């Protein structure tokens, strides 16, 4: 739990951690992770408001299509270095009000 | 006995004997004193005059009226003249010093095996039948090349196999064994002591090279951050320490000790100059006395920044200080150097380019150069060649598609986009489309950006650019090439009207999930009534569930691109929805500041432009920033709400 | 396989091999190459030359075997009767065939000998010296001795054909063998002094050569303890039989034989030499397998000199062990380049096991106790992988840091006891500003510190007095200029006679040359004290401070709060490590301009980072409720550091940003 760093200008916790995924539809995904991209200088010509280009990797190579906003839950989540951190992830998932509270490697393209 | 100041002159100190230097400098100007000198010794005076004017010692301190030293480097390696060094290496060597610089150049092109062999040849042929300077230098360079080979082989064949798939073993195993055997227990500390006693008295100034750390000048660098309210004695020493190592063909210019203080001098100098500015403004005035920052980057400054800095270090430079206030001198020379880098990249990938050590040594400076290029006004042809190289011949193992797009957006900030650059980007998009015909090929990016941003940038710079090639590719589409249709969906604005008409029939809109898929890929621009009715049923479904995308619908309504009024009947639930649909009757006690951290420039501009929420939002932000040190809330407050 | 081959070695061989390696690493090993290394690959020997002398002289081939005297009598007879021309022609015909070098010569030169002495007239060793890239002044005739070009001597005792293939240039006949001291006095004296003052290892000789017997007879007239017994690398294909070994060991030859080491054939000279050479070389990179007795012995051999020193910082302990182990500042140790026995790991495990200590030697328990007391005071705890709750307390057990002027004044007024008390008194005197008396105290310490063989006190006193000379010169220059107008009275600090005296005795000092002029054992044991002469000792922790500054600022701009270890603990534990080293040992340059700025920069960074961490923008919980436990508790030492190494401008800038 020494690799978790909270970022301020975007409500996110960076942590090299993989979480199993359960969404509203029956399709289920194994341990995966998110990558957020804070870009306030992004081309938003259309009705785009988000400053974060948030996407998902399944196994570091499998980027799944966004499609609908799946109602994902953290389920069992592993740091892949020390031990399972399920509580340590779910406890700070709330009181954030930002989608994908815990991601890995925010790119911070300014 | 004499303090040779780096600014150009010399000052006296501890010369208990006669003042030979003062008399020499006095006779430098008087022609009669020159004439009265003896004939056999006159040529020696001429040689001394040539040496002293070359090294940059002008005059004494009592008459040092002119002291501006224009640094000049004539080394071929500094300017990255690879085409010249290759031709020189192909040319046979006539002497030993020419052989020495051939060895050094061979070391800078990554061919370390040939460089080591040629250094061994020099050692054999110049054992002691000279002044010994070449023998000493070629012993040190040999050891440094051996260290570099060991470090590369412990890393390239150690862990970096995935950087080229399978072990490329750039150095042969027999060669590795030979260099290990020939260099068992080579004492580098005592090497200078093994030289003849005459050498140790004459070339005493070459002692530091045989040391584990020799550049203990960093302790002097602590004078750059003293807050007493110059710095030119450090920059001149940096050039003084670069014209030695890079012009005497020495193999101590690629290690981490050299790169560490160059990354420390060039950072401390710019930071202190940034502190000289923004501090004189406090008591002198913004523009009445704020002429310039003080620092002036030149060709030999940009080259150092390119060669030694990394991307994270450059970003740290940009975050701390505003480099945009620092003008880049000698724009033409920077343009030519960048064009040379682009030519080298183009020639490297197009050819075999299997040689990997030089690739790794040179890709860093190439990336740093094309990163810093945004500060230099590049010529039209030069920019065209730069962009062509960066798009079609830069390896994808180092620069991903997202980083590639970031690089161009960085380059287009300080320069427009004439027809040539947009034509190059159009050709790149065409190449991507032709690559997408393979249904098993997918883009990999570590920045979130993709090929959509290229079309978006083209449209932003040119509102009516219709890529006829893309239109023809769309016309020639089939049903089974689903991935191609998706990719062309991502670039809808760049297609022609008949192309759009043919494409839209392939994939229509469905319910809300596909609706939002089309919105993300920009399928629809004006919200058609059918889309509007589809929206309501989702909200009507939400009411049943309540008795998500709701924030998106509220924001769209706030942006006035949704003109439906019956949705006004559906308020009193989510905070953001009511905020963006009915600011009149919102009770503001439920507002959360975190929302403001997800809004781009235009949304905050529209929020600030509205009267009914400006005061509430600004007082919320002030309350939040009073009790916290968050820079994001203050940044939002000052950029848009003042 | 070779690792256990080193084990199947007699204790005499075990100690001889380590002695040779120690001499080689000490630059004291002088090789003695003889006939047998040359004839290894293809070089012709003297027997065939004597055969052709018999042919040209006696008509018929030699019958039977010629005796030892005939080896020199037959060529002498040929020279006396037929003359010099035919002799020179025969030598020219024989000795012109160039032969390639052999790996044994490369192995010999790979041990970095201080000198090599050979009786070979060939240039095989000479060419191997040139081709490998190692310089040697060739001394073969008398005139070369006067014209020596360097300090390394490739001595050709019997001469060579470098000036021409002539009989005079080489000692081959009986006349020049008998009249050797009357023809080659200088080279003989040089050989004798090299053998006396260095370590000699004979290779190639076989106890049946005139040179070996002459040297052994020369040894008999060298008292008892005035000479070292040279080593002997015998490579005959027969066991030493253990009686001639006794005879030659009594006469002064510690024989090492290759027949016992390896089971080679009778025509395996190459393998016979190569076994011993590889065994010697492989022992130059590592020591033998260790036990509880030797590990503590090795550590005490590498740490005992540091005992005289009051305190030693942790970063340079890698130099003590020569980059074998990376000593982390937090008190942990990690493996960096120790490609051998893990002595530090075993030391720490034996530290953490009382039962493993009961099997120690008699007094080695006391040595380990001393090492434990030393390491406990130095803050090192355990290995890097095994470390937890490493909280440590910062303490300075000195008086200059605490600013107790009256206390150290009273201490100065008290009587002296030893050299250490005088040293600390001189440092206190310099701190009080009475530099005039401090210089005299340091001079007296220098004078009285050489009668006792310590070195540390003398070296540190010289450094301190040189820095005091710098300080008083700076004070004088300030006073006679700006200081003359800052205050009314000029206030002449020191007498003109004293200034003239210090100027006379300070000229041509060459401070950086002080360590080079130090005795070899002093610079070997105190490798870390070289950094005190120059400003290298701040480079190690300045390069890693300018890099943590950018790292912390990057997080400042990025706004990434961390919930784990703070990056400002490496600098914090380096502040009170360099400060403790500089103050506890009572060195000067605690008021050095460069050292003050490093402290100021580190303090400024610490306060910036701590004030940033104080106002966290966290509205959520930490690990469970909160991660941080405390902040920047400005201790007494922190206040002293801020008060002593800051100016008004620096504190003002710090206030206007925190």
Author numbering:
A (entry chain C): 11 to 120
B (entry chain B): 337 to 565, 580 to 897, 911 to 1005
C (entry chain A): 14 to 671
Paste lines from the article.
Defense-associated sirtuin 2 (DSR2) systems are widely distributed across prokaryotic genomes, providing robust protection against phage infection. DSR2 recognizes phage tail tube proteins and induces abortive infection by depleting intracellular NAD+, a process that is counteracted by another phage-encoded protein, DSR Anti Defense 1 (DSAD1). Each DSR2 protomer consists of a conserved N-terminal Sirtuin (SIR2) domain, a C-terminal domain (CTD) and a middle domain (MD). DSR2 assembles into an elongated tetramer, with four NADase catalytic modules clustered in the center and the regulatory-sensing modules distributed at four distal corners.
